[PDB]
Amino acid sequence: NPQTREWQTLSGEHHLAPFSDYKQLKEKGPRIITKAQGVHLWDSEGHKILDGMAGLWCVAVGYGREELVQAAEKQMRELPYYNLFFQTAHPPALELAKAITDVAPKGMTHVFFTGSGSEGNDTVLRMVRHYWALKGKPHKQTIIGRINGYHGSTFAGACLGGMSGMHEQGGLPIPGIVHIPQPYWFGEGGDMTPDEFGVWAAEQLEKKILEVGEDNVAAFIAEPIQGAGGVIIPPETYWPKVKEILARYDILFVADEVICGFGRTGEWFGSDYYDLKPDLMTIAKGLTSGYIPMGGVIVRDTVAKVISEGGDFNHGFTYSGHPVAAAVGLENLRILRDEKIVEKARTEAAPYLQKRLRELQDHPLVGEVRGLGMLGAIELVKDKATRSRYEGKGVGMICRTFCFENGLIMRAVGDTMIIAPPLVISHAEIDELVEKARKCLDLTLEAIQ
Amino acid sequence: QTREWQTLSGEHHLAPFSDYKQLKEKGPRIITKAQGVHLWDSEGHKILDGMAGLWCVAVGYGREELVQAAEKQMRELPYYNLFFQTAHPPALELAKAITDVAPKGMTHVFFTGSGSEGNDTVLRMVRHYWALKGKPHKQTIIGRINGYHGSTFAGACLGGMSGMHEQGGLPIPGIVHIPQPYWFGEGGDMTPDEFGVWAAEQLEKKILEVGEDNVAAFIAEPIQGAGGVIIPPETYWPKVKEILARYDILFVADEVICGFGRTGEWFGSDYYDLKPDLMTIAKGLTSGYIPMGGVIVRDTVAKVISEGGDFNHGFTYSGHPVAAAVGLENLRILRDEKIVEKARTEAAPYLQKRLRELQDHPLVGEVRGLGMLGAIELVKDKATRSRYEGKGVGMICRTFCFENGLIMRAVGDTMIIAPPLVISHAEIDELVEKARKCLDLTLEAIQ
């Protein structure tokens, strides 16, 4: 009603939002978020809203940490920008690279800097193929991804992931990208027990290697826990089985830690969680807690032999290792580490979140509650034993809409409700979430039957 | 210690467009401070920055208005996404700002983090747009040799650097390249004007080759940047326009470099009175103080809205609120403090004059420049426009240029400048003085 309407007519006439139906957006008008603090935020109509998604999986330390505001201001005044092209560097970017590598697994010794996760996965793509072409195998290009995996919205990042909705937009794909099925027991694994589905899903990797040809396979790319396509937590058997395959074949492993990176699963990385030894690690989001745009790729020492016969690695972006972004990053890692936010997430926040969320198991609508560290998903079903869904209907969108109106951001991927709140969420704020969540699950159920 | 920071780079950093083995043997040059158009290294050496970082620091280093715009926004609202049918005030009012300085009918902005992400955005957009209009077969993008459009997979395709095409495997289907209008190096014994016509007509050749009904768009920078400042002959763009009218394809102007005051006008599209459909932007949007890019979209091409359904595209940090505030505040300064106007009227003619007095120098084949762009051709023979085969003339100047406190870059044997728009006549004096000295030193090192 107040200034909202002015901002709303503007969006309609001048703005094109990510992943949106702009015709619809205009008929409703978007919701404007203006302020935020802690884990909460306010819309232009004064409604306080608990943010259970941490913006978009990125605001790790929560909203309003002034340490980062001052880290930025100082850097921006002293040196706002200088490129990393001209055989040149600046202190932020170097000491950040050092910080990341220290919290990264054994042998993750290098960082190539990008502005986003998407630009990160582009970086992996040109890297992996260059790496093989350097090793004398330029035919070896094919990347194995997965259905319902997300890896970016660049051309490369959309072609690497397995969203059909994206593949339909942008024309003929990049040659040399193929997809195996996702280890989503709940929705895909029919009458199999979780454990044996995880083995099935893992062995499909070996199927695809032998199909395409080992000597044609450049890398396997996967998120440790898929994010955008629901929080598809794998069966226990999946990663261990996958590791056994990886050892036998001579291809690179790419862990997309964009979401899993920096405390989301209780550990620093998902690769730490499932004791994975990747070659490359996509990162973004929580690197700077989203206070400033930044992404990157963490590179294993052995792969970083691109240095040798590195007849220039003709890659990079203007704002690679942007000094203001690096200061915010460096300062962010100090807080995460020294104030023991990741440690507090694993020990204090996560078990409390997992408990209070799994008491929604009883609710008529809930087929399953699954979650790990500061990830959590709730399956909405028509029948718990069959794991069936309400064909069309749009159950998930209904919850989401209630969830919003009762001051909760908990997002819907199909009929899977999702959360991934800031790591610094207090037991009280966790109470607030679960309370609101139950109310909206009740309201949802009412709206069907 | 520099040395400490240098051994670090070696052990932990992979810099853009660099030979990391070499980088380690030398150690990189670390930049710590800057002010105005100048910069300091960790050894205390002052250096005039003739490239504005990387074509981006329009208003120059040290403008506190932007530091405060950031701080305020970061405190109030550090981030919120634009995915969840959600928005925030910065991004909306910035979109409005840009559209106002953009040519007639440029009414919309899709936000990205870089120019590369911008060109990815154009690619998915253009093909979706045609698929929406009932022609999903219509995908082919026409670019140009020595054109630069990004370092994403899409952006490295799209552009015509061979060095990039050799890295990343088989290209994206439906991208073809016509020749660049670089008279000085390519044109031979044609007069500039007739080369520009030749180069332009090669577009029509490619349309008819591939098939109109297969052609989605032509993509070009108004003035190529990364591949030297290839200022086109006067005839090129006018000729190109005449082709564009006759055929049913989209025009994509990559204003990443040309955008926001670099050619005296707001855009190169304003300079050459072009009516594009889509406009790639970045760099000067936020004067590079904070990472941001985007795509400006013509009203009619916003038919992606109708029937479109979801446009399944975008990045987490699309329209990042801190970045937008710095952007909005940056546009206010550019506009209201008349920096673009001062660039055209006061800075540019002075820069163009003082730079073209290097025409006389034995090594200089040509001096060309426009607004706050400038290039100097280094030759072995002025009349033939020949080069010192290999030798690496350009890299020699660059190295002198650095050691005598000037950032003037080398693309092959073309010295390049594009300094901040706010450069004073005094600082322009400083550049040209240093430039002559290094051209002298260069010549000494060869012949």
**DSSP per residue, B346-381:** IIHHHHHHHHHTTTTSTTEEEEEEETTEEEEEE-SB
| Chain B residue numbers touching A322 (CB-CB < 8 A) | 290-291
Neighbours of A204 (CB within 10 A): 18
3-state SS of chain A: helix, strand, coil percent to 5?
40, 20, 40
Measured distance CA(B19)–CA(B116) in Å, rounded? 22
Q: Which residue of A has its CA nearest to B16?
A: A316
| Chain B residue numbers touching A69 (CB-CB < 8 A) | 71, 74-75, 78
Q: What Å resolution does this PDB entry report? A: 2.8
Category of B222 on φ-ψ map: left (φ > 0), alpha (ψ -120 to 50) or beta: alpha
Question: Looking at chain B from residue 58 to 87, which residues have their Cβ under 8 Å from any Cβ of chain A?
Answer: 61-62, 64, 66-67, 70-71, 74-87
Q: Where are the beta strands (DSSP E) in A119-235?
A: 142-146, 177-180, 217-222
User: What DSSP string describes A276-325?
Assistant: ---SEEEE-GGGGTTSS--EEEEEETTGGGGGTT-S------TTTT-HHH
Question: Looking at chain A from residue 373 to 392, which residues have their Cβ under 8 Å from any Cβ of chain B?
Answer: none
Cβ pairs bridging A and B (under 8 Å): 439
**C-alpha distances in angstroms, B81 versus A447, B85, B293?**
29, 9, 16
Measured distance CA(A380)–CA(A368) in Å, rounded? 8
Question: Considering Cα of B78, then B81, then B85, then B91, what sign does the dihedral take?
Answer: positive
* β-strand pairing of B215-220 with B250-254: parallel
Angle at B249 between CA B247 and CA B254, to 5 degrees: 125
* β-strand pairing of A416-419 with A375-380: antiparallel
Tell me, what DSSP letter sits at residue A191?
A: S
Strand arrangement, sheet containing A408-409: A408-409, A48-51, A40-43, A31-37, B86-87
Contact B201, B239 (CB under 8 A): yes
Task: Give the distance from CA A397 to its chain's centroid.
Answer: 21
**Quick one: which of B7, B42, B47, B1 has its CA closest to B27?**
B7
**Cross-chain CB nearest to A15 (options B17, B109, B308):** B109
**C-alpha distances in angstroms, A247 versus A119, A240, B188, B251?**
28, 11, 57, 49
Three-state DSSP state, A329: helix
Neighbours of A135 (CB within 10 A): 12
**Helix pair angle (B321-336, B64-76), 10° resolution:** 150
Measured distance CA(A408)–CA(A414) in Å, rounded? 18
**C-alpha distances in angstroms, B266 versus A38, A263, B273, B334?**
40, 44, 12, 9
Measured distance CA(B142)–CA(B161) in Å, rounded? 14
Q: Going by C-beta distance under 8 Å and a sequence separation of 6 or more, which residues neighbour residue A22?
A: A16, B302, B304, B305, B308, B311
Three-state DSSP state, A255: strand
Which segments of A390-426 does DSSP mark as H helices, in order? 395-405
Q: Phi and psi for B123 in degrees, rounded to 5? A: -70, -55
Category of A45 on φ-ψ map: left (φ > 0), alpha (ψ -120 to 50) or beta: alpha
Tokens at B82, concatenated: 């634009």
Contact B126, B172 (CB under 8 A): no
Tokens at A149, concatenated: 């995996």
Measured distance CA(B371)–CA(B368) in Å, rounded? 10
Q: What own/partner pairs with CB < 8 Å and gap ≥ 24 does A301-309 have? A: A301/A107, A301/A108, A301/A109, A301/A110, A302/A107, A303/A127, A303/A131, A303/A252, A303/A279, A304/A109, A304/A110, A304/B14, A304/B20, A306/A127, A306/A130, A306/A131, A306/A134, A306/B14, A306/B20, A307/B20, A307/B21, A307/B24, A308/B21, A309/A134
Give the distance between the most distant pair of CA atoms in chain A.
66
**CB–CB of B114 and A317 under 8 A?**
yes
**Quick one: which of B174, B176, B172, B173 has its CA closest to B160?**
B176
Classify residue A79 by burial, with Cβ atoms within 10 Å: 0-12, 13-18, 19+: buried
| CATH code that applies to domain A31-64+340-448 | 3.90.1150.10
**CB–CB of A313 and B80 under 8 A?**
no
Angle at A101 between CA A95 and CA A102, to 5 degrees: 90
Measured distance CA(A251)–CA(A143) in Å, rounded? 9
Q: Where are the beta strands (DSSP E) in B290-446?
A: 293-298, 364-370, 373-378, 406-407, 409-411, 414-417
Tell me, what DSSP letter sits at residue B304?
A: S
Q: Which residue of B has its CA nearest to A297?
A: B14
Question: Looking at chain A from residue 305 to 334, which residues have their Cβ under 8 Å from any Cβ of chain B?
Answer: 306-308, 310-322, 324-325
Chain B CB within 8 Å of residue A91 CB: yes
Task: Give the distance from CA B349 to its chain's centroid.
Answer: 21
User: What DSSP string describes B230-243?
Assistant: BPPPTTHHHHHHHH
**CB–CB of B19 and A64 under 8 A?**
no
| Chain A residue numbers touching B307 (CB-CB < 8 A) | 23
- H or E stretch at B246: helix B236-246
A412 bridge partner residues: A417
Three-state DSSP state, A418: strand
Contact A308, B338 (CB under 8 A): no
Tokens at B84, concatenated: 């969840």
Compute the residue count for chain A: 449
Category of A360 on φ-ψ map: left (φ > 0), alpha (ψ -120 to 50) or beta: alpha
**Domain locations in chain A as residue ranges:** 31-64+340-448, 67-338
């500039």: which residue's tokens? Answer: B192
């504005």: which residue's tokens? Answer: B52
| CATH code that applies to domain A67-338 | 3.40.640.10
Measured distance CA(B73)–CA(B186) in Å, rounded? 49
**Quick one: which of A309, A258, A290 has its CA closest to A152?**
A258
Question: Considering Cα of B214, then B220, then B226, then B227, what sign does the dihedral take?
Answer: positive
Contact A356, A434 (CB under 8 A): yes
Tokens at A152, concatenated: 């970016």
Three-state DSSP state, A249: coil
Contact A111, A297 (CB under 8 A): yes
**Quick one: which of A217, A207, A284, A223 has its CA closest to A252?**
A217
B46 bridge partner residues: B40
Angle at B317 between CA A97 and CA B110, to 5 degrees: 140
**Quick one: which of B150, B258, B33 has its CA closest to A77?**
B33
B374 bridge partner residues: B369, B417
Neighbours of B433 (CB within 10 A): 12
- H or E stretch at A328: helix A323-338
User: Three-state SS across B166-222?
Assistant: CCCCCCCCCEEEECCCCCCCCCCCCCHHHHHHHHHHHHHHHHHHHCHHHEEEEEECC
Category of B219 on φ-ψ map: left (φ > 0), alpha (ψ -120 to 50) or beta: beta
**Cross-chain CB nearest to A18 (options B23, B66, B318):** B318
Residue type, A332: N
Three-state DSSP state, A133: helix
Fold of B65-336: Aspartate Aminotransferase; domain 2 (3.40.640)
What are the b/e assignments for A264-295, b being 16+ CB within 10 Å? Answer: bbbbbbbbbbbebebbbbbbbbbbbbbbbbbb
Classify residue A167 by burial, with Cβ atoms within 10 Å: 0-12, 13-18, 19+: middle
Measured distance CA(B265)–CA(B338) in Å, rounded? 11
**C-alpha distances in angstroms, A278 versus A70, A222, A251, A298?**
35, 10, 11, 10
* β-strand pairing of B278-281 with B293-298: antiparallel
Question: Looking at chain B from residue 229 to 268, which residues have their Cβ under 8 Å from any Cβ of chain A?
Answer: none
Fold of B2-62+338-446: Aspartate Aminotransferase, domain 1 (3.90.1150)
Contact B69, A69 (CB under 8 A): no
What are the b/e assignments for A361-395, b being 16+ CB within 10 Å? Answer: eebebbbbbbbbbbbbbbbbbbeeeebebbeeeeb
Contact B211, B156 (CB under 8 A): no
Question: Looking at chain B from residue 202 to 221, which residues have their Cβ under 8 Å from any Cβ of chain A?
Answer: 216
Domain A31-64+340-448 and domain A67-338 have a common topology: no
Residue type, A154: T
Tokens at A398, concatenated: 């209904």
**CB–CB of B54 and A90 under 8 A?**
no
Q: Going by C-beta distance under 8 Å and a sequence separation of 6 or more, which residues neighbour residue A248?
A: none
Q: Going by C-beta distance under 8 Å and a sequence separation of 6 or more, which residues neighbour residue A447?
A: A398
Category of A78 on φ-ψ map: left (φ > 0), alpha (ψ -120 to 50) or beta: alpha
**Quick one: which of B297, B107, B105, B106 has its CA closest to B217?**
B297
Measured distance CA(B408)–CA(B419) in Å, rounded? 9
Angle at B357 between CA B355 and CA B359, to 5 degrees: 95
B280 bridge partner residues: B254, B295
